[PDB]
Design a binder for this molecule. Sequence first.
Ligand SMILES: CC(C)C[C@H](NC(=O)[C@H](Cc1c[nH]c2ccccc12)NC(=O)c1cc(Cl)ccc1Cl)B(O)O
Ligand SMILES: CC(C)C[C@H](NC(=O)[C@H](Cc1c[nH]c2ccccc12)NC(=O)c1cc(Cl)ccc1Cl)B(O)O
Ligand SMILES: CC(C)C[C@H](NC(=O)[C@H](Cc1c[nH]c2ccccc12)NC(=O)c1cc(Cl)ccc1Cl)B(O)O
Ligand SMILES: CC(C)C[C@H](NC(=O)[C@H](Cc1c[nH]c2ccccc12)NC(=O)c1cc(Cl)ccc1Cl)B(O)O
Ligand SMILES: CC(C)C[C@H](NC(=O)[C@H](Cc1c[nH]c2ccccc12)NC(=O)c1cc(Cl)ccc1Cl)B(O)O
Ligand SMILES: CC(C)C[C@H](NC(=O)[C@H](Cc1c[nH]c2ccccc12)NC(=O)c1cc(Cl)ccc1Cl)B(O)O
Ligand SMILES: CC(C)C[C@H](NC(=O)[C@H](Cc1c[nH]c2ccccc12)NC(=O)c1cc(Cl)ccc1Cl)B(O)O
Ligand SMILES: CC(C)C[C@H](NC(=O)[C@H](Cc1c[nH]c2ccccc12)NC(=O)c1cc(Cl)ccc1Cl)B(O)O
Ligand SMILES: CC(C)C[C@H](NC(=O)[C@H](Cc1c[nH]c2ccccc12)NC(=O)c1cc(Cl)ccc1Cl)B(O)O
Lengths: 177, 177, 177, 177, 177, 177, 177, 177, 177
Amino acid sequence: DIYSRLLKDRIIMLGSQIDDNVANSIVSQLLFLQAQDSEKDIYLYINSPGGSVTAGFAIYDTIQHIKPDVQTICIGMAASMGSFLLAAGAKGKRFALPNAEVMIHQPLGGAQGQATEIEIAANHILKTREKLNRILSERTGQSIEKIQKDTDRDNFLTAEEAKEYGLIDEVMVPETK
Amino acid sequence: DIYSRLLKDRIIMLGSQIDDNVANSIVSQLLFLQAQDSEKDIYLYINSPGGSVTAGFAIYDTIQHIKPDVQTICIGMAASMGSFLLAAGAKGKRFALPNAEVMIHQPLGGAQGQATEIEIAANHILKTREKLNRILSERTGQSIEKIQKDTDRDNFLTAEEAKEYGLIDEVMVPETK
Amino acid sequence: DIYSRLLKDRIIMLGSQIDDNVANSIVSQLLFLQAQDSEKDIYLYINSPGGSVTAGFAIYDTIQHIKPDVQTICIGMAASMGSFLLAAGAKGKRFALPNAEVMIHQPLGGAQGQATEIEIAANHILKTREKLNRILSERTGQSIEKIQKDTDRDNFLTAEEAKEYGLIDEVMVPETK
Amino acid sequence: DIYSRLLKDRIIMLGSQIDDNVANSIVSQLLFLQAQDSEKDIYLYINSPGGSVTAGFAIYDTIQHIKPDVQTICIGMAASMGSFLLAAGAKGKRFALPNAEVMIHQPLGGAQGQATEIEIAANHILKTREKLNRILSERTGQSIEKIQKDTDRDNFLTAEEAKEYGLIDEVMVPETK
Amino acid sequence: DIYSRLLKDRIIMLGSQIDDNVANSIVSQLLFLQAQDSEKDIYLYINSPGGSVTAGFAIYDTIQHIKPDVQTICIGMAASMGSFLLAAGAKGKRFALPNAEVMIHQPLGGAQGQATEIEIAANHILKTREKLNRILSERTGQSIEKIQKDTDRDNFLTAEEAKEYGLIDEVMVPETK
Amino acid sequence: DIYSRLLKDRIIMLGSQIDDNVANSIVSQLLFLQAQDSEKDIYLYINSPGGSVTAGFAIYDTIQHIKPDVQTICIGMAASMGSFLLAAGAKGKRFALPNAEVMIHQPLGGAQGQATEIEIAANHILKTREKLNRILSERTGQSIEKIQKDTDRDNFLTAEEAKEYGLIDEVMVPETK
Amino acid sequence: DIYSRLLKDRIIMLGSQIDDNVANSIVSQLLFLQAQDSEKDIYLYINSPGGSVTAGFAIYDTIQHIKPDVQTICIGMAASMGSFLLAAGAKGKRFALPNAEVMIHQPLGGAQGQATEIEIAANHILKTREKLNRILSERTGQSIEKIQKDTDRDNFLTAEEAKEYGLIDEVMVPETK
Amino acid sequence: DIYSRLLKDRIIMLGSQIDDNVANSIVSQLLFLQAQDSEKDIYLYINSPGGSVTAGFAIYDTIQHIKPDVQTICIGMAASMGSFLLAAGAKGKRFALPNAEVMIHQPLGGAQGQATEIEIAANHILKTREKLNRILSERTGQSIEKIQKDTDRDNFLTAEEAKEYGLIDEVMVPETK
Amino acid sequence: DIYSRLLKDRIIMLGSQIDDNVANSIVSQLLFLQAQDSEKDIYLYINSPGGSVTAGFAIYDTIQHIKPDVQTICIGMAASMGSFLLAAGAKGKRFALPNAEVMIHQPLGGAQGQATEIEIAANHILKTREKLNRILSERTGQSIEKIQKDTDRDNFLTAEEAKEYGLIDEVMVPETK
Ligand SMILES: CC(C)C[C@H](NC(=O)[C@H](Cc1c[nH]c2ccccc12)NC(=O)c1cc(Cl)ccc1Cl)B(O)O
Ligand SMILES: CC(C)C[C@H](NC(=O)[C@H](Cc1c[nH]c2ccccc12)NC(=O)c1cc(Cl)ccc1Cl)B(O)O
Ligand SMILES: CC(C)C[C@H](NC(=O)[C@H](Cc1c[nH]c2ccccc12)NC(=O)c1cc(Cl)ccc1Cl)B(O)O
Ligand SMILES: CC(C)C[C@H](NC(=O)[C@H](Cc1c[nH]c2ccccc12)NC(=O)c1cc(Cl)ccc1Cl)B(O)O
Ligand SMILES: CC(C)C[C@H](NC(=O)[C@H](Cc1c[nH]c2ccccc12)NC(=O)c1cc(Cl)ccc1Cl)B(O)O
Ligand SMILES: CC(C)C[C@H](NC(=O)[C@H](Cc1c[nH]c2ccccc12)NC(=O)c1cc(Cl)ccc1Cl)B(O)O
Ligand SMILES: CC(C)C[C@H](NC(=O)[C@H](Cc1c[nH]c2ccccc12)NC(=O)c1cc(Cl)ccc1Cl)B(O)O
Ligand SMILES: CC(C)C[C@H](NC(=O)[C@H](Cc1c[nH]c2ccccc12)NC(=O)c1cc(Cl)ccc1Cl)B(O)O
Ligand SMILES: CC(C)C[C@H](NC(=O)[C@H](Cc1c[nH]c2ccccc12)NC(=O)c1cc(Cl)ccc1Cl)B(O)O
């Protein structure tokens, strides 16, 4: 209704910025679908400009953790945290529509206060970047140094280039649902 | 609905800042579940950057007060009051997902007025800090003096570090709901 | 729902500032529960930073007026008008959770206009303070003179200190709902 | 619900400023309860700081018009138009709770524009004052001159003094609903 | 400079709204010019949309009081208080340029607060209107009831109609300074 | 300085919107230059988008009243009241530079209040429009009816079109000062 | 310049609200004139709607303190602190122009904070009102209780009424500088 | 000019809040006057509602440091830091005009940030209070414990009470400059 | 004037936050006093809450560069960069008045953008901190580690403690200019 009816078909729509509210809703729907049936696939549609790293990791870890395969399907755009969750779907079941776009880039943040507070914030966001680089590296088959170089600034990829990159497994063609 | 549906499985989702409204909601849900069944465990997911000390304590004392064990599960991030409540779960039943982050730091506040009013407010927040340090020492095994030094500035912990710190008992591995 | 299902258990949640809207809601629930059953206790949980004196008195006089005993349970914080209503529960049925805070202080207000109007507002808030002191004297056993001195500025009390002051009867211990 | 449930016991809750929207709701509820039963009393609880004179008169005249007796019960504060509606209840059935506050004062207003516009607005509010004094006189037994003098500035009354004045008939004592 | 140079020729320019600042400056210039020479005429140019009644009366009474004849010359527009000061120049020496405009209308004000404060405000602005009607009546040769009727709303007069009205003595024609 | 130094050359610069302050300055400069010499020409440069009708008539009538010829020279733009004041210069001495623009249109205004107030304001602005049409008719040799039609909406003219219209006498050619 | 030239004639223009800056300016001018000549009178024109009590008292006591007589001359309006200073001129040398208005009323202020702070502010402004009443009684010949009643609300006086009240000595007539 | 011409008479005017800008001006004037003449008295008039403690101490220490005696004359009001500087003038040369007010109270401030920053700010402002109490003790002959209690809240003093307190030496009486 | 005349006594007044405008002014005054005379001492008064590090370094290095000794005199408060410039005065000629305040603390900053930008900003302010510690160490005789530890949070010092610390050479006593 309309999402509630698609939920009955094990479909979840991720169609916005990823903040704490959106993460909790997505995680709750993943938990629910598994409680309903722990074997059948889940279908996660992603059209998102990104969002918070920790909200993204709530979703990522919940995907990794439950028993069902979570298929990921990029429609429109999956950028930043959105392309991270796209790459998080079950290997072999990560898709993009032919004109969907994918963007990857390094994390952003802020820091204010005493020199020692700024340095704690700096160190924390550097450690977070290395963790993201490492995980995306394992999700894509790329080296860590390739991820670091390719995310230094915004890096826009077509569906076909995202497949060659390893972020998705197949570009979805029409005539099938 | 979707949280109403998870509530039938005795799951509470704490996914935001902890203000007085959030705290009454969590407290009410804790009371509701005990009233339906005072023996079965409750599952409290925490994704929270923290919030008010007194709202936190409404949740904390209610967790300790009811008969059911309250399992705490950190997804994404438990910072500040979020990690105090994470530590507050039933011992042996405090978890974090593998990429969740935990952060601890001393309390923050504000004071304006006459010198004597500012002294009253300084004395109250120092006493609040001694009360928080004492309870976290009891919950983790760290000494009060170590809690004091370790919370002087922001202190970010991975899941495994939260385990060794004593804030949780196990890092959750996948292949199990 | 969630408060509605707790209502069925004769539980009323007071978890915000006390204004006219909040007071009207709490009086109604009290009135409602007496109509349902005039003998069975009511349970009033208090987490409030205070609020309006006249709205508080609407709750106070309604609590004293109905037949059911109204138990007061402080979770988190009962400050200012919050702690006055905490002290207003049936004697022997006024509680605080072990880490809840209680605070008492004199009333605050404002006045603007002609010298004559400022005098009228000052006289009114002073008489209101004497009325509050007299009632709190009756509820706690402390003398009016001691309440006057102890509320001159903000006075924060632990649960145990609130018991020795007479604001509550017991600190509630765990292992019981 | 919660007010709908109490309306089935012929209770109406007036707990805000009296404006046009509030007056329509109160008038409607009065009209509705008469329609259901034109003989049984109605219970109007009043916790109001006052409000619009014409909105107040919509309520006042509806109280006088309908067949049922309308008991007024002051909880918290009946100020300005609030206290006028308090005096409007059926004689013998006008109550205040022991610590409720009653306030009377003359009407306030504003005028802007040409001198003749300002004169028209002044004459209208002076006439309105004489109408209100004349009615409060019939309702209380005080003379118009005494009302005139006693409302020149804000006049705060305890529940007992409001009884001595004629605004209410009885202070309500406990051990009864 | 440029006004200071014209001041040496005994010319004052009133070219703005009449507030207390402007009145103080015009009055100071009148006092100065008389101090320089108490017998030669002064030339007051008026282009003004009006302003405060009391600021206007500061200027009016200073014109009436000093020894020199004050000639008044309307250029552009003299409305409200501006047409009052125009009519206040020495009889026989009040002028308008051929296309200048004159407007007369009743005073405007505001009033807020208690009925008795609004009535004092109304009474004062009505007495002020009668005083203005009376003085303008004597300046123009019209009856008081004619002034009252013609100022009920905004009343725009050409220079020629201002001369027939009595507000000015001659329409100034060209080829002279 | 630098305008003050052009003043000693009998040059006035009108380079902005015409309000009461600007009219005051221009009138004062006109009075001042006649004071210095009643015979020699004045030179009024006009680059103005227009402005207030009454402020414009203060300048217009002062131009007409004084003894010296006032030459008018359009540089850049003379629109609305600016082109009215361009046409006001001494006949035979009204100029535009080759690329100057002139614009004529009917007056604009506003009104709010009671129907009879709106009628007073409408009648006043229609009457002002007939006065402006008649003066421009005398200044240009065009008939009032043709002014009426040609000003119904914004009517932009080149310098050559303004000379054919009668608004200026000559388009000023270079090689002279 | 223009006030600097008038200061050469020992004239001070008080033409605005009385705030601390205005008061320091007036006080400095008073001291300046005494320093040039401690024997010749000073002329203080007052057109003022009032202002701060303590800034008024800085002017007042300085007027009383210096050797020169200070003549007070009301043009336009002396209201509130303005009429207190008018009354403060050297006896026999307090004037108003014939259409000047004088207004007297009780002081206004504001208080917010704790009951005891509001009591302190109420007490200070009542004692300030008794001080102002006592001095106005001495300057006018009215008894303190008549001042008290007459300033309860705004009390507008003509020049002749201000003379009969004792606030000035003479109404100024024309034909004299 | 006007303050400039008073400066030549060794008169300094302190008539506003005391911030760094004001303090820098007053210190400069004091330094300047000492350079001109190290032996002749300086006259410092005070009409100030107070201001910053450190800016005040910049003025205070400069007054004690220079050779010339600095007379302090309170006109209007010396409150807070204003009354501290009043008490700082050369003993026997500290004055108030008869209707000037004096007010003393404890310092006010604000703190925001971590618990340990709030503690640092509280300790600082308390130490500052003790330093001010000790110095006022020396300036007035009152004990520290009596200043502590008498400044707990706003303490308004007449000129006569300020003399009995020791804040000034004499009330200045008229017929002397 | 008043600062221009003090400048002829080779005095400079630093009495505000230190930004680029203030630094340019101070640097220029130093450059100008050296131009006038390269041997006579300069007197820099400091009442500053601090400000920009690079602005302060513009002043610091100019003090070190010019020929004359630059004496520094703390009046009121030298905080942050203020206390750094205080220590920058010629050794043996760094003073504080007896009640002046000195405060030292570490630098503060802000950073926003990509992780690599935040790292660049953190490294730059850490390097700035080591530079400031190193200079203050040479200026005071304290070790860098002690400076480091003593500036971790705001550190307030009396004038006497600033002497003991090595920020100044003497506390200035009175009876001397
Ligand atoms: C690279 C990609 C996989 C993730 C991107 N998200 C981010 O880069 C980071 C989240 C983050 C990590 N460490 C931080 C330290 C301080 C602040 C924020 C952060 N933050 C934001 O976007 C952001 C920043 C602010 Cl200040 C407020 C709200 C948000 Cl949501 B993306 O664009 O989806
Ligand atoms: C250490 C950790 C377990 C708690 C942290 N919470 C806090 O530190 C404190 C709550 C508090 C305790 N005593 C106070 C005295 C004055 C003001 C606030 C407080 N306050 C805030 O956070 C805050 C502050 C303001 Cl002004 C407004 C709203 C909030 Cl909610 B965290 O970050 O979760
Ligand atoms: C001591 C304790 C038991 C009560 C405290 N409440 C109060 O002190 C008083 C209510 C009151 C009584 N007499 C008044 C006269 C004028 C204005 C307000 C009041 N007022 C406020 O709090 C307040 C004040 C304003 Cl201006 C606006 C909104 C509110 Cl709600 B606490 O903090 O709970
Ligand atoms: C004496 C008592 C029984 C009633 C009081 N109500 C009033 O005095 C009057 C209503 C009124 C009557 N004649 C008027 C003429 C002009 C404007 C308002 C009015 N007005 C307000 O209250 C008010 C005023 C404004 Cl401007 C805006 C909104 C409101 Cl709601 B009380 O305080 O309950
Ligand atoms: C008829 C004509 C000769 C004068 C006109 N002036 C006025 O009508 C009156 C001044 C006045 C007299 N008694 C009052 C009572 C209350 C308020 C204002 C007034 N007031 C304003 O214009 C106005 C009003 C406000 Cl609220 C603020 C600023 C101003 Cl300046 B005109 O248009 O020149
Ligand atoms: C045809 C040409 C020679 C004049 C044009 N000026 C105008 O048309 C008129 C001035 C005017 C006359 N009678 C009025 C009645 C009500 C309001 C304004 C007016 N008004 C404005 O321009 C305007 C309008 C407002 Cl609402 C505010 C400020 C101004 Cl200045 B032009 O464009 O130079
Ligand atoms: C009766 C007559 C001779 C004086 C009148 N002045 C006043 O009545 C009083 C000054 C005053 C005395 N005790 C106070 C306590 C609190 C606040 C203000 C005051 N205050 C204001 O007017 C006002 C009020 C505020 Cl909040 C701010 C700025 C001002 Cl300037 B009048 O109208 O000239
Ligand atoms: C008792 C009397 C002799 C002085 C009073 N001044 C003060 O009490 C203090 C100054 C001060 C001392 N230690 C502080 C610590 C933190 C902040 C301020 C301070 N502060 C203010 O006044 C204030 C406060 C703020 Cl937040 C902003 C601007 C100012 Cl200027 B009075 O009223 O003259
Ligand atoms: C330790 C002491 C000797 C100096 C202190 N000054 C500072 O700490 C630093 C200046 C600075 C150095 N490196 C930076 C990197 C990023 C931003 C600012 C800085 N910055 C501010 O003060 C500040 C900060 C902002 Cl964001 C805006 C305006 C200012 Cl002016 B103090 O308090 O005098």
